[PDB]
């Protein structure tokens, strides 16, 4: 399915709202401030993911390895560069309070690889 | 910040945390109290000066 | 109590003006098979489509079927709001909701919200959860 | 619709006022500019949906 | 006098953009013959206007437009009570709004104005109240988890196309009701089921002008909106969301 992001007008830099031309029934995105309009390609207006089935690796940032508080391990090497050291923690976020799955971040600079076993 | 709290990306702040808390000793307490009192004094002085000006005579500061 | 939001995994609203060639590719077979027999007219079909996919584990746990879900939504929304469902054998159980002859997009958004909030598929209302156990006393 | 709406309380203002009106008052009337000030990354769609109702209301 | 009454009702309830000429012809033939009767017709018009249903008002204004230009007596009576006609037609009264239909109310107002300029251009000087009125409008108002999915039976119902139903439904097929076992020719194995289906087939063989305010709501799109937008439903929407808010917290 995927997610849908908003579109901006090229004239006033305002968001394009969903609209439709009955004559051709082609998904249009018409800015409701001015007369500008555009032809969509996603063919999707709104999605609501209840299962919130998303990857925490996207939210995980690679600069967290410089935290003198989180634990470190040498038993989970980085797959991208083979570095032995890694920093691990939990999801520690809402809708992810369970699933104690450990999220590992490579300690070596310029790699910042984030992965999960 | 309100958004991140809504999606749960950030945790709601707790009042009991002392990082979110500050202490008020004699210094700030007196300053705050004095500030109100000094203004009251200014007003009193302004009232006296205004009434003397309305009466037409200059007012002695003392 | 089992409301709709409970079993629904994901909800999506598309623009699919041509039911014969649906926007989503993994529906063509059963959607065209459904639209072969004109039990419902195609002219009255609204072009906005609400595509909701369910959770199979919730299917099995609640013993809820596609026929029952369709019957419940039909009883709730007359012949006005027709819904088409696949067989209970695919890897992804998904059914489509369209209005039948404010913008229809926002109207369908409100309809989806109402279904998810207060579409009682089964169970006694104002009963949250039932705990099942043997008494040791 | 029934979306979540972001609204702000300004001192000495008797009635509660939406944040988008406040941003327009500060001089950022472009919806894109308001979005840059609100959300820093435009590739995150969830925040954009979350602020959609405020833009719609204003 | 009875005949003129019937014509007035017919024009108001015609429900068309333009009133039927024959009937208008008849009204005209009745109006001239007697000046008193013309005055009575004028009277009737205003009464019809002061009721409801702007579409009927719009139909009434077409009658008023015709009797103004071709009758000086009627031309005087309209001027004599031009204030009331101004509220009834243009909807300039601060209290009374234009009744439904809304699109018909738009047509009544738009068509009313275009008359007034011509009304004033041709008869403004002679009739002083009319001249004041046109200026007034223009300028003032502007875990068990038992999961099994065995599906071997088929509906096998005889479709009108000659092919058996291939739908795989556990209990009920939506196009054919309950599902019963059938052979290769789509005949229920139970003779009782065959008899019941035959009985069902026999049962199947045995089987103003404008839309009122209630009639306008009588449709599909309105019914689903009424159910969705309900005081109990919205509260149930909030109450259901409150319970997940407790789970979220
Ligand atoms: Zn624009
Ligand atoms: Zn690495
Ligand atoms: Zn069948």
Curated annotation (Swiss-Prot), chain A:
Keywords, in A-Z order: Acetylation, DNA-directed RNA polymerase, Metal-binding, Nucleus, Transcription, Zinc, Zinc-finger
Acetylation listed as a keyword: yes
Gene Ontology cellular-component terms listed: nucleolus; nucleus; RNA polymerase II, core complex
Major subcellular location class: nucleus
Subcellular localization, as worded in the UniProt entry: Nucleus, Nucleolus
SUPFAM superfamilies: Zinc beta-ribbon
SMART domains assigned to the protein according to its UniProt record, in alphabetical order: RPOL9, ZnF_C2C2
Gene Ontology process terms (BP): maintenance of transcriptional fidelity during transcription elongation by RNA polymerase II; transcription by RNA polymerase II; transcription initiation at RNA polymerase II promoter; transcription-coupled nucleotide-excision repair
ZnF (C4-type) ranges: 9-34
InterPro entries xrefs: DNA-dir_RNA_pol-M_15_CS (IPR019761), Rpa12/Rpb9/Rpc10/TFS (IPR012164), Zn_ribbon_RPB9 (IPR001529), Zn_ribbon_RPB9_C (IPR034012), Znf_TFIIS (IPR001222)
Binding site for Zn(2+) 1: 9, 12, 31, 34
Pfam families on file: Zn_ribbon_RPB9, Zn_ribbon_TFIIS
GO molecular function: DNA-directed RNA polymerase activity; nucleic acid binding; zinc ion binding
Domain of life: Eukaryota
ZnF segments: TFIIS-type: 74-116
Binding site for Zn(2+) 2: 78, 81, 106, 111
UniProt function note: DNA-dependent RNA polymerase catalyzes the transcription of DNA into RNA using the four ribonucleoside triphosphates as substrates. Component of RNA polymerase II which synthesizes mRNA precursors and many functional non-coding RNAs. Pol II is the central component of the basal RNA polymerase II transcription machinery. It is composed of mobile elements that move relative to each other. RPB9 is part of the upper jaw surrounding the central large cleft and thought to grab the incoming DNA template.
Family label: Belongs to the archaeal RpoM/eukaryotic RPA12/RPB9/RPC11 RNA polymerase family.
Subunit composition and interactions: Component of the RNA polymerase II (Pol II) complex consisting of 12 subunits.
Listed name of the protein: DNA-directed RNA polymerase II subunit RPB9
Organism: Sus scrofa (Pig)
Gene name for this UniProt entry: POLR2I
Swiss-Prot record, chain E:
Signal peptide limits: none
GO cellular component terms, semicolon-separated: chromosome; nucleoplasm; nucleus; site of DNA damage
UniProt record, GO biological process: protein ubiquitination; response to UV; transcription-coupled nucleotide-excision repair
Zn finger (UVSSA-type) location: 152-179
Compartments it resides in: Chromosome
Region listing for Disordered, in residue ranges: 1-19
Reported effect, residue 31 to R: In UVSS3; mild phenotype; impairs transcription-coupled nucleotide excision repair ability
Family annotation (InterPro entries): ENTH_VHS (IPR008942), UVSSA (IPR018610), UVSSA_C (IPR049431), UVSSA_N_a-solenoid_rpt (IPR049408)
Keywords, ordered alphabetically: Chromosome, Coiled coil, Disease variant, DNA damage, DNA repair, Isopeptide bond, Metal-binding, Phosphoprotein, Ubl conjugation, Zinc, Zinc-finger
Pfam families per UniProt: DUF2043, UVSSA_N
GO MF annotation, one: RNA polymerase inhibitor activity
Similarity field: Belongs to the UVSSA family.
Assembly mode: Interacts with the elongating form of RNA polymerase II (RNA pol IIo) during transcription stress. Interacts with the TFIIH complex during transcription stress. Interacts with ERCC6. Interacts with ERCC8. Interacts with USP7.
Protein name, as recorded: UV-stimulated scaffold protein A
Species for this entry: Homo sapiens (Human)
Annotated gene: UVSSA
């Amino acid at each position: 399915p995927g997610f849908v992001g908003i579109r901006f007008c090229q004239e006033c830099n305002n968001m394009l709202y969903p609209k439709e031309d009955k004559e051709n029934r082609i998904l249009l995105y018409a800015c409701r401030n001015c007369d500008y309009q555009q032809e969509a390609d996603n063919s999707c207006i709104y999605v609501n993911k209840i299962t919130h089935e998303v990857d925490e690796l996207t939210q995980i940032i690679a600069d967290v390895s410089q935290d003198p508080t989180l634990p470190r391990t040498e038993d989970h090497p980085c797959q991208k560069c083979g570095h032995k050291e890694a920093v691990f923690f939990q999801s520690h976020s809402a809708r992810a309070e369970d699933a104690m799955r450990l999220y590992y971040v490579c300690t070596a600079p310029h790699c910042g690889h984030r992965w999960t076993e | 910040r309100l958004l991140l709290a809504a999606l749960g990306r950030r945790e709601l702040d707790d009042r009991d945390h002392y990082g979110n808390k500050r202490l008020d000793l004699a210094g700030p307490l007196l300053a705050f109290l004095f500030r109100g009192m000094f203004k009251n004094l200014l007003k009193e002085v302004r009232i006296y000066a205004q009434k003397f000006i309305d009466r037409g005579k200059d007012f002695n500061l003392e | 109590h089992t409301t709709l939001r409970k079993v629904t995994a994901n909800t999506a609203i598309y623009y699919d003006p041509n039911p014969q060639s649906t926007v989503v590719a993994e529906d063509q077979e059963w959607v065209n098979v459904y639209y072969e027999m004109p039990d419902f007219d195609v002219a009255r079909i609204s072009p906005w489509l609400l595509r909701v996919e369910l959770d199979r584990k919730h299917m099995t746990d609640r013993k809820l079927t596609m026929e029952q879900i369709a019957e419940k939504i039909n009883a709730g929304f007359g012949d006005d709001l027709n819904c088409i469902f696949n067989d209970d054998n695919a890897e992804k159980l998904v059914l489509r909701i369209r209005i039948m002859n404010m913008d229809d997009d926002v109207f369908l958004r409100c309809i989806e919200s109402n279904m998810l909030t207060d579409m009682t598929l089964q169970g006694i209302e104002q009963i949250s959860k039932v705990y099942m156990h043997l008494p040791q006393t | 619709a029934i979306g979540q709406r972001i609204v702000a309380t300004l001192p000495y203002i008797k009635q509660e006022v939406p944040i988008i009106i406040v941003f327009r008052a500060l001089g950022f009337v472009s919806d894109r500019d308001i979005l840059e000030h609100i959300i820093y990354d435009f590739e995150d769609p969830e925040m954009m949906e979350m602020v959609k109702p405020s833009l719609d209301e204003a | 006098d009875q005949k003129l009454s019937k014509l007035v009702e017919e024009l108001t309830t015609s429900g068309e953009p333009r009133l039927n000429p024959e009937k208008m012809k008849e009204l005209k033939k009745i109006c001239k013959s007697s000046e008193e009767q013309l005055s009575r017709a004028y009277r009737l018009l205003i009464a019809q206007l002061t009721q409801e249903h702007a579409e009927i008002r719009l139909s009434a204004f077409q009658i008023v437009e015709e009797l103004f230009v071709r009758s000086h007596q009627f031309r005087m009576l309209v001027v004599s009570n031009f204030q009331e006609f101004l509220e009834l037609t243009l909807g300039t009264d601060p209290a009374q709004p234009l009744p439904p239909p809304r699109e018909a109310a738009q047509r009544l107002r738009q068509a009313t104005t275009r008359a007034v300029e011509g009304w004033n251009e041709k008869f403004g000087e002679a009739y002083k109240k009319l001249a004041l009125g046109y200026h007034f409008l223009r300028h003032n108002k502007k875990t068990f988890a038992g999961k099994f999915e065995p599906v071997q039976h088929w509906c096998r119902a005889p479709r009108p196309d000659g092919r058996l139903c291939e739908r795989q439904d556990r209990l009920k097929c939506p196009f054919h009701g309950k599902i019963v076992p059938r052979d290769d020719e789509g005949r229920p194995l139970d003779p009782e089921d065959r008899a019941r289906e035959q009985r069902r087939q026999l049962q199947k063989q045995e089987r103003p002008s404008l839309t009122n305010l209630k009639a306008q709501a009588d449709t599909a799109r309105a019914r689903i909106g009424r159910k969705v937008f309900a005081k109990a439903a919205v509260r149930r929407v909030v109450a259901a969301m409150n319970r997940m808010d407790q789970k979220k917290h």
